Fold Sec1 family domain containing protein 1.
Amino acid sequence: ASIRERQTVALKRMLNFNVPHVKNSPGEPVWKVLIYDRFGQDIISPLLSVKELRDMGITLHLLLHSDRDPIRDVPAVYFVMPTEENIDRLCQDLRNQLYESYYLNFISAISRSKLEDIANAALAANAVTQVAKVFDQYLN
């Protein structure tokens, strides 16, 4: 479907988004982390798997509602829903500095109010973050 396609559009982008990262081992791919939620998995899985996740160059993929590992030396991605709870996880992971980067990706149409929370959620620790486009804003 043309719709389901747009879903992967953002994904394939974030899952490959090579952002300004430091290179320690010359001659090594770009390891990127990902953090998905109930919806995030509801979209990433249908168009991605565990073996494909690591096969694309993922350093770690876990649920915001789980024990996140400390990988400040590797860029991270947060493809989740901008829900009240999620917004709290953003400021929770942003302050912990679990990952160097935080390529955010909202499933629904977040608002300036909720957005400011995540935007500032990082400002608290000054973590490099970037809110990507949404796909489920029309479906899912």
